[PDB]
Write a protein that binds this ligand. Structure first.
Ligand SMILES: O=c1ccn([C@@H]2O[C@H](COP(=O)(O)OP(=O)(O)OP(=O)(O)O)[C@@H](O)[C@H]2O)c(=O)[nH]1
Ligand SMILES: O=c1ccn([C@@H]2O[C@H](COP(=O)(O)OP(=O)(O)OP(=O)(O)O)[C@@H](O)[C@H]2O)c(=O)[nH]1
Ligand SMILES: O=c1ccn([C@@H]2O[C@H](COP(=O)(O)OP(=O)(O)OP(=O)(O)O)[C@@H](O)[C@H]2O)c(=O)[nH]1
Ligand SMILES: O=C(Cc1ccc(F)cc1)Nc1nc(-c2ccccn2)cs1
Ligand SMILES: O=C(Cc1ccc(F)cc1)Nc1nc(-c2ccccn2)cs1
Ligand SMILES: O=C(Cc1ccc(F)cc1)Nc1nc(-c2ccccn2)cs1
Ligand SMILES: NC(=O)CC[C@H](N)C(=O)O
Ligand SMILES: NC(=O)CC[C@H](N)C(=O)O
Ligand SMILES: NC(=O)CC[C@H](N)C(=O)O
Ligand SMILES: [Mg+2]
Ligand SMILES: [Mg+2]
Ligand SMILES: [Mg+2]
Lengths: 535, 535, 535
């Protein structure tokens, strides 16, 4: 029968950006390929109640769950490597834990006590941790919960989450709880040596708060010598079979192979006494084939904020790559700044060499004149376009500006526009999954191969239903709607007007996975391949 | 001209209950008697937004300011030793600072940053500290702000307030900022020696977070030897003129004399470069005369929760003592449990030896049948009664039960009573100061020697105006009201019915001070003296 | 007139091997080129009383001072960058401080107290620090003492030296004392970013023991962005003019140019209120010319332990390079393992491509059969040879084996040899400087251009005077001796036997400096150039 649910606490030392979330995700994939029901959670030491207030260009994209919670992008890495939907519960923050305890205090639920960091804040954290172990919506209890602790050991803001994890270790005992600590091994070029001292000091910090690590992930630019691993194991009081050399992999999809080569998963399974079974590599070997052996290559313009890669579009880039993997193409992303595309000559300079244009949306942007101006170019050049949320809105304002409505805009972007073709139906923010119905033999229905779909939403403006008939004279079809028809969900040109120009109000990159590409990106990358081949 | 405003941070080590608030108050009195405009503030490390949720029998009375804020009782010690009204600003807590920062975050006021303990929580604390330095409602800038830091150095919950105080020291520099650290010197009886090691470890803890103490208050049951003070000064890196031996004083009013004997005030004034002037002892010498040389002695029953002293009635006890000081009486307080007074024989056993009965109110009590039953006894015995808030309500329900209304109660205490003579006019909670007008030649007007008064309120039930005429047939007069007459504020029997039986809806113990006793307690202790003398 | 002597404490964070000793040396050179009398000292946190017990291949060479003390090699970096002789006082260790205090205790010099880490160990450290400030053998008080603190902040063994430095800062005050902290900024390649978190945690550790850094040396593989320096200055409470970006330089002689470009020396001089004068670059500009613009290039075999660079021969390699600089040659060092040179074919394979053979000595070696075998080859091939200490001993045993004495050896290396031509005159270990007199028109006298010299010694075996006449028949001349003639100090072949083959019992690499090459290395590199050119 099933064991008690095990808890694995991934902590971090020396610095952030060591790839700790991708390490935890890869371990989740390894434990899943042995046949265990893994689930994952992140604790964020910052006070924002959710990232919906933070700028995504500075702090990365907001991820959205099926239930509509807004979360850190590591929940996106977990969903991609697990191929599992995660609840909003999967992202705790300090901002939420304090607000919850203070609200319980104002209602008198602590019966006249003084409220304190210990026990009340740590009890709320420990409650939110052990909540993840509860039977799912189908009654399946998970085998392992992998809680990743944000921040760095010895940040002030981390000290309640580490204390709650220590208390979970005290309550359940070592048979049920494992601590994995991620650390940096730096290389010093002038003297040609790897240094273990930062890992020693970081494990000493972790021991001074009452945690003993069961294993060490040694992040390094080169493979750590065995003599150094022995020195660490002796200095850190860690089993040598738990000292895992983790050099920089070529792609993120190789990290499971690195960890399996070191046998970290076997060490965890044995030390947690989990049911041992072999890793089924079949699916991930097929992914790594498509990743490493592309037959062709295509260039896609991502019409973003700036001419450089941004974590604001991490999920979009991953979804484009997965679309490529479906075709066994490479996808190379041309990061194109919107503002250079406001003039038609600037647009031609930015886009003329690419094979498709992706218009992403989000929050924290201005300057959609250059987005429309890239659409206006792409249509004349005959390039395929995929528009996501704001992308659809720019497509529909282009079409408004293609018929008579030369001053048309969104009410969001020109509050004085005489033609607000995009308008609040601040209105309701639609969040999470909503259903939609699709026109039969639409280009969208040919992509999805179904008439009914659902997608994840995060927007509050809509297509103004007063202009549907006007802008249909552009040629554009409203090939998908809410089941009542009240809301436009998808727009397309007919294939004889342009081979593939599609918009959606949703964020389909959120439902994409590397081993299960989303239909619209498979369709769009198809269209880009066909343009390149015919061009 | 006036200097920059100085900041004095009183911190605490080894344990709570060392009398740190009374020490800070006594230093405030000493600096005031030199002629400086002192003001005081407390920081509370607990998460309750205010103490109005805590039980006062477990955690002490809720103090109330003129503006109606609810605060820790140390604000009461400050008001009593300064004889100054303090704003609600004078009690910060963690509960308030977090709720404020989280609310600013939800409104987007941090412009897309991650919100962190440093800088944002420490900036909110530092802002609330330096707020105290601002010019008052008359434009007077204070000379010194004495912020007392709650908790113990090395409590987790204190670490943001100490960090904010360190940053204030960094911003203003040593010329403007002083740190006073209070510590315990224990005595070990089996080996007959005072131990300095706890003070060494507490100053080491304070130094490990970047604070250097300017002076040490050594709390002890006996006067610390000079050799030990020299050892501490050498071990702690403190000026020997800052090592202050502070043995347990006979009364709290002696603590200024202890501190002045050690010359702590001169050391502070010199080290802060404040305008040096001599202490005017005249008023406090008169207080210490009345305190130490009572001509007579009277017993007052405080009809409370239990037969032992409670911090739930600390201000009531201080106001009774100040009433005594006005007469040069001693007051001895008989702590009488209400529940023994429910039966008339039990009431007679509890009260028969005393000379007056005080019925206090508050929150966190049940059992007012025994309160009425003590009033019913006191009236038959001819003892004077002072009723505060709930005390008035019990007086008026006694009178309802004296005429025909034998099942009368408050709606608070029997929700099914057929005669709710006390009722919500949960209704409005009245908080802070409100004005009232008094009947000419009422016993209240003879006490106050004015027809217009104000008092501090904290209640939400009222006398039901539907029963005024009925209960006036008890003999009771509604000798004071709101200026519109809508609310009963004071009730009394005529002097020929009982010599002094008075109730008020307010908490007059909050406006009392040791050098300025409140009129109603001077009147009540007068009546008790006259009963004793005539009895 | 002269100020009080300033104290500069260079500390280290995150890891060792950051080049902290070379940074302190380069700052010493900069302050010297302004005209200040700098002096330097190192504190070693290890318990060895001196490095003469440690293996040099594992822990680097033992340096030797004029007075014969044995010290860490950082004293060699100080001597090379200052061009100043340093006393044995310049290397404190924990091993010495404890042994000194325990010996004073056994003699009763603490008059019956308990002896403690504080005050007695920290008083001994503080005494040894302030000793460096005393007037020199000519009466000159130094302007600055630059004490470098070994180890890493937060090593247990460092905590007494940091406490002593804090007490020096307390005693002399900020006007006289400066703290420079060296830290690592790592680069993470997968995400392309520099991380400041290790520096934040290392400065927090330094602040938790009561030290505030005046400046930060940021060691990095690339130049740190100004935005990061501003973030560090804000997070660390350091003046932005003290945040010094210190990327990896091409050669160690460039480090003064890096530090002067950042204006660190001006910041120190100003913050210490030292007499400001401009840097005279003339000599160091001439050095950097010769370093960066070599006209030719020569290969020298260093016949050592292994085929890789070793810190066991750091001073030898520096002396060879300085010899090159005198000629404006490059010197490239062929690291040749002795054991491959035991066979004549192996010797020919190891050495045939080089232009000169250097035979170094020391302790911690065996296998001098291969050293003699490289000499035997070099003589037949006509390559010049310089033999240092053990090198001379191998030359003289080669010559013993060239005449009749085929089993001759040292008594150190074959205790049963029937011909101990090298013998203990364990005998006296000669340490430090001794004088020697040289044969007129010896090859040595032509190198030194004097008949009288002194050199630094560290050996206990000698040439057996019983074999002088026998081995002179090899052709070898005893071209220098002790002034009494009792000890052989130099040996050479006549120029017609070999153009340059010289041995010495001393370690002339210790007296070499980059701006003042030692005569024997200038002569030997000359001979190698002449062989290459004629060959
Ligand atoms: O300058 C000095 C002087 C002395 N020591 C002494 O050397 C000991 C070892 O100090 P290390 O810096 O070499 O640490 P480590 O070898 O154990 O790990 P790595 O970072 O190199 O990988 C330390 O305990 C210290 O006492 C130094 O490290 N540096
Ligand atoms: O049992 C022992 C053994 C040895 N020692 C050693 O004695 C030294 C002094 O330790 P103390 O306990 O006496 O501290 P103190 O005199 O400075 O201050 P007081 O609390 O007594 O007032 C300490 O540094 C410790 O090394 C003990 O204290 N106790
Ligand atoms: O995974 C997480 C989650 C949350 N946070 C929160 O982000 C804040 C900043 O944490 P950083 O890691 O980014 O430190 P830093 O920017 O100040 O310096 P660098 O090393 O990057 O150069 C921290 O205070 C933490 O609360 C993380 O760092 N990582
Ligand atoms: O390549 C990227 C940038 C990126 C980030 C997130 C993405 F979804 C797609 C790309 N990051 C990488 N991290 C590693 C790694 C991590 C841990 C252990 C070993 N190697 C290799 S590459
Ligand atoms: O007597 C009481 C109990 C009490 C509390 C609060 C009150 F308002 C009335 C009484 N407390 C005392 N603290 C000291 C003391 C304090 C500091 C330094 C020296 N002595 C003497 S007595
Ligand atoms: O090149 C070597 C190896 C070596 C060691 C000692 C020697 F004597 C000769 C060579 N070390 C170097 N350290 C730096 C450096 C140091 C500090 C700051 C900036 N750059 C450049 S190169
Ligand atoms: N989620 C998004 O892309 C938002 C797009 C646009 N700002 C809107 O609110 O409609
Ligand atoms: N402040 C009090 O004494 C409250 C008394 C009573 N519980 C009321 O609310 O009316
Ligand atoms: N200093 C050295 O080179 C020592 C060489 C040899 N071991 C000797 O003692 O004579
Ligand atoms: Mg090492
Ligand atoms: Mg003692
Ligand atoms: Mg960062």
């Amino acid at each position: 029968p099933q064991t008690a649910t095990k808890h694995l606490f991934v902590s971090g030392g020396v610095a952030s950006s060591l790839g700790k979330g991708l390490t935890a995700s890869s371990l989740g994939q390894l434990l899943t390929a042995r046949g265990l029901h893994v689930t994952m959670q992140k604790l964020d030491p910052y006070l924002n109640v959710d990232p919906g207030t933070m700028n995504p260009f500075q702090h990365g994209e907001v991820f959205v769950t099926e239930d509509g919670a807004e979360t850190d992008l590591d929940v996106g890495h977990y969903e991609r490597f697990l191929d599992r939907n995660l609840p909003g519960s999967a992202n705790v923050t300090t901002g939420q834990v304090y607000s919850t305890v203070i609200a319980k205090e104002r209602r008198g639920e602590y019966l006249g006590d003084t409220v304190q960091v210990i026990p009340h804040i740590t009890d709320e954290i420990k409650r939110r941790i052990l909540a993840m172990a509860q039977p799912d919506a189908d009654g399946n209890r998970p085998d392992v919960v992998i809680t990743e602790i944000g921040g760095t050991v010895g940040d002030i803001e981390s000290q309640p989450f580490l204390e709650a994890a220590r208390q979970v270790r005290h309550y359940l005992g070592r048979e049920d709880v494992f601590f994995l600590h991620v650390s940096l091994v730096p290389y010093l070029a002038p003297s040609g040596e790897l240094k273990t001292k930062p890992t020693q000091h970081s494990v000493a910090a972790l021991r001074s708060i009452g945690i003993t690590p069961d294993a060490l992930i040694l992040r390094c630019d080169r493979d750590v010598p065995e003599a150094l691993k022995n020195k660490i194991a002796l200095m850190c009081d860690v089993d040598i079979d738990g000292v895992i050399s983790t050099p920089d992999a070529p792609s993120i999809y190789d990290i499971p192979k690195v960890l399996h080569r070191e046998e970290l998963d076997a060490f965890v399974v044995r030390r947690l006494n989990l049911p041992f079974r072999d890793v089924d590599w079949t699916e991930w070997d097929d992914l790594l084939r498509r990743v490493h052996e592309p037959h062709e290559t295509v260039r896609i313009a991502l019409v973003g904020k700036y001419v450089e890669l941004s974590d604001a579009y991490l999920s979009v880039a991953e979804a484009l790559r997965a679309g490529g993997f479906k075709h066994r193409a490479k996808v190379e992303i041309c990061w194109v700044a919107s503002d250079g595309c406001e003039t038609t000559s600037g647009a031609a300079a930015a886009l003329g060499d690419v094979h498709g244009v992706l218009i992403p949306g989000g929050f924290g942007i201005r300057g959609i004149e250059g987005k429309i101006g890239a659409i206006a170019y792409a249509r004349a050049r005959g390039l395929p376009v995929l528009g996501l949320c704001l992308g659809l809105q720019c497509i529909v304002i282009e079409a408004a500006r293609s018929v008579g409505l030369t001053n048309a805009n969104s009410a969001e972007f020109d509050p004085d526009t005489p033609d607000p073709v995009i308008a609040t139906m601040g209105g309701t923010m639609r969040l999470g999954s909503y259903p939609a119905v699709l026109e039969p033999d639409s280009v969208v229905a040919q992509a999805y191969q179904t008439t009914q779909v659902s997608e994840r939403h995060r927007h509050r403006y809509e297509v103004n239903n007063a202009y549907r008939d006007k802008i249909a004279e552009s040629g554009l079809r409203f090939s998908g709607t809410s089941p009542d028809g009240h809301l436009v969900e998808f727009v397309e040109y007919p294939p004889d007007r342009h081979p593939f120009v599609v918009g959606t109000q949703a964020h389909p990159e959120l439902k994409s996975r590397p081993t299960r590409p989303h239909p619209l990106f498979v369709a769009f990358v198809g269209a880009a391949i066909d343009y390149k081949a015919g061009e």
